[PDB]
Amino acid sequence: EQAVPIQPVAGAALAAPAAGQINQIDPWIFQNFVQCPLGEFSISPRNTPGEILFDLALGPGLNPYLAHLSAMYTGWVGNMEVQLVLAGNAFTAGKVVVALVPPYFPKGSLTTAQITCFPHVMCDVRTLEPIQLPLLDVRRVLWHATQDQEESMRLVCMLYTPLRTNSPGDESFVVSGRLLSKPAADFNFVYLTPPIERTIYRMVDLPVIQPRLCTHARWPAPVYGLLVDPSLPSNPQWQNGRVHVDGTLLGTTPISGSWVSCFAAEAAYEFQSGTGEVATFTLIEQDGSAYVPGDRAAPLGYPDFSGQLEIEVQTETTKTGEKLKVTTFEMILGPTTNADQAPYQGRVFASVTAAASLDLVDGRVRAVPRSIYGFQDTIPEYNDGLLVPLAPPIGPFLPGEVLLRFRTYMRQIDTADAAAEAIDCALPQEFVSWFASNAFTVQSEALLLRYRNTLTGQLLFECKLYNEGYIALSYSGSGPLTFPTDGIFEVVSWVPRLYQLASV
Amino acid sequence: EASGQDLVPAAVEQAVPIQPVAGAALAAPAAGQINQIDPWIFQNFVQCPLGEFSISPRNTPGEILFDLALGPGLNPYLAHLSAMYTGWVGNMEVQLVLAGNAFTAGKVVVALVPPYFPKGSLTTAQITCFPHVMCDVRTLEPIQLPLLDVRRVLWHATQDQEESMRLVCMLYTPLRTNSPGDESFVVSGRLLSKPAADFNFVYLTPPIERTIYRMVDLPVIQPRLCTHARWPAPVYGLLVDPSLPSNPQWQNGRVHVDGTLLGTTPISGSWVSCFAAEAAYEFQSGTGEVATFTLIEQDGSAYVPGDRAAPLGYPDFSGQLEIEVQTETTKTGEKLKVTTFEMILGPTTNADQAPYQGRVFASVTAAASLDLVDGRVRAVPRSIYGFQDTIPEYNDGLLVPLAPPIGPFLPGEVLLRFRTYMRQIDTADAAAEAIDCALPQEFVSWFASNAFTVQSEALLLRYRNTLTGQLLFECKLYNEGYIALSYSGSGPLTFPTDGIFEVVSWVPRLYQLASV
Amino acid sequence: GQDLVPAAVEQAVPIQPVAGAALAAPAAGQINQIDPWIFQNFVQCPLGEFSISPRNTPGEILFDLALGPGLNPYLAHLSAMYTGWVGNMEVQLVLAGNAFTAGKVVVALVPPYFPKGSLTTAQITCFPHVMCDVRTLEPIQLPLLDVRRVLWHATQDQEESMRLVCMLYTPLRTNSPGDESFVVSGRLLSKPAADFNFVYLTPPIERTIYRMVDLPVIQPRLCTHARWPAPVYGLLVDPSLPSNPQWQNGRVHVDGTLLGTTPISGSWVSCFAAEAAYEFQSGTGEVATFTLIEQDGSAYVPGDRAAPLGYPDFSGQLEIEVQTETTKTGEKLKVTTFEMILGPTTNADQAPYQGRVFASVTAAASLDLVDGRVRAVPRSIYGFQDTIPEYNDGLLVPLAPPIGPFLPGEVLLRFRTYMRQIDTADAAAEAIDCALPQEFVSWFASNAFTVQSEALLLRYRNTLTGQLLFECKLYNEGYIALSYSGSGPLTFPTDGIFEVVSWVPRLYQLASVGS
Length of chain C counted residue by residue: 515
Please tell me whether residue C499 adopts helix, strand or coil conformation.
Answer: strand
Using the Cβ of B149 and the Cβ atoms of chain A, whether some distance falls under 8 Å is answered with yes
CB atoms within 10 A of CB A114: 17
Say what the resolution is, in angstroms: 2.4
Neighbours of chain A (3+ CB pairs under 8 A): B, C
**Contact (CB, 8 A) for A389 and A345:** no
C197 DSSP β-pair partners: C86
CA gap B502, B219 in Å, rounded: 9
Q: How far is A287 from chain B (nearest CA, A)?
A: 19
Of B446, B341, B384, the closest CA to residue B231 belongs to B384
B328 DSSP β-pair partners: B336
Residues from chain B contacting residue A19 (CB–CB below 8 Å): 19, 21, 150
Phi, psi dihedral angles at A430 (to 5 degrees): -65, -40
Are B149 and A194 an interchain contact pair (Cβ–Cβ within 8 Å)? no
Interacting residues of C438 by C-beta distance below 8 A, sequence separation 6+: C223, C224, C225, C226, C250, C266, C269
Are A386 and C356 an interchain contact pair (Cβ–Cβ within 8 Å)? yes
Q: What DSSP element (H or E) covers A402?
A: strand A401-403
Of C364, C366, C363, the closest CA to residue C337 belongs to C363
Of C86, C89, C133, the closest CA to residue C107 belongs to C133
Q: List, in order of start, the domains of chain A with CATH numbers.
A: 12-189 (2.60.120.20), 211-250+391-495 (2.40.510.10), 258-376 (2.40.30.120)
**Contact (CB, 8 A) for A379 and A306:** yes
CB atoms within 10 A of CB A242: 25
Using the Cβ of A20 and the Cβ atoms of chain B, whether some distance falls under 8 Å is answered with yes
Torsion of CA C505, C509, C514, C515, to 10 degrees: 150
CA gap A353, A330 in Å, rounded: 9
Q: What DSSP element (H or E) covers A99?
A: strand A95-101
Length of chain A counted residue by residue: 504
CA gap C71, C76 in Å, rounded: 7
C231 DSSP β-pair partners: C224
Q: How far apart are the first and last CA of chain C?
A: 67
Whole-number Cα distances in Å, B50 to B53, B94, B190, B351:
9, 13, 9, 55
CA gap B251, B401 in Å, rounded: 11
Interacting residues of C330 by C-beta distance below 8 A, sequence separation 6+: none
Length of chain B counted residue by residue: 516
Residues from chain B contacting residue A137 (CB–CB below 8 Å): none
**Contact (CB, 8 A) for B108 and B169:** yes
Of B80, B73, B116, the closest CA to residue B94 belongs to B73
Please tell me whether residue B7 adopts helix, strand or coil conformation.
Answer: coil
Residue A459 has, within 13 A of its CA and on its CB side, a CA count of 9
User: Which residues of C268-370 form beta strands (DSSP E)?
Assistant: 272-279, 287-293, 315-325, 333-341, 357-360
Using the Cβ of A284 and the Cβ atoms of chain B, whether some distance falls under 8 Å is answered with no
Strand arrangement of the beta sheet that strand A405-409 belongs to: A422-425, A405-409, A225-228, A481-483
**Contact (CB, 8 A) for A76 and A63:** no
CA gap A267, A284 in Å, rounded: 11
Q: How far apart are the first and last CA of chain B?
A: 35
- DSSP code per residue over B282-329: EEETTTEEEEEEEEE-TTS-----SSSSSSTT---SEEEEEEEEEEEB
**Contact (CB, 8 A) for A422 and A194:** no
Q: Which of residues 90-119 of C touch B (CB under 8 A)?
A: 111-115, 119
Strand arrangement of the beta sheet that strand B143-147 belongs to: B46-55, B187-195, B92-97, B143-147
Q: Which residues of B294-320 are buried (b: 16+ CB within 10 A; e: fewer)?
A: ebbbbeeeebeeeebbbbbbbbbbbbe
Interacting residues of A356 by C-beta distance below 8 A, sequence separation 6+: none
CB atoms within 10 A of CB B223: 21
**Contact (CB, 8 A) for B259 and B447:** yes
Q: How far is C428 from chain B (nearest CA, A)?
A: 45
Q: Select the residue of B126, B129, B150 nearest A20 (Cβ to Cβ).
A: B150
Interacting residues of C296 by C-beta distance below 8 A, sequence separation 6+: none
In which region does residue B288 sit, left (phi positive, over 0), alpha (psi from -120 to 50) or beta (all else)?
A: left
Whole-number Cα distances in Å, B478 to A189, B408, B484, B500:
42, 10, 8, 18
- DSSP code per residue over A266-282: EEEEE--SSS--EEEEE
Are B30 and C19 an interchain contact pair (Cβ–Cβ within 8 Å)? yes
Strand arrangement of the beta sheet that strand A52-57 belongs to: A52-57, A154-161, A95-101, A120-124
Q: Select the residue of A104, A113, A117 nearest C84 (Cβ to Cβ).
A: A104
Of B503, B495, B485, B510, the closest CA to residue B242 belongs to B485
CA gap A54, B442 in Å, rounded: 67
B460 DSSP β-pair partners: B476, B505
Are B29 and C15 an interchain contact pair (Cβ–Cβ within 8 Å)? no
CA gap A268, A350 in Å, rounded: 10
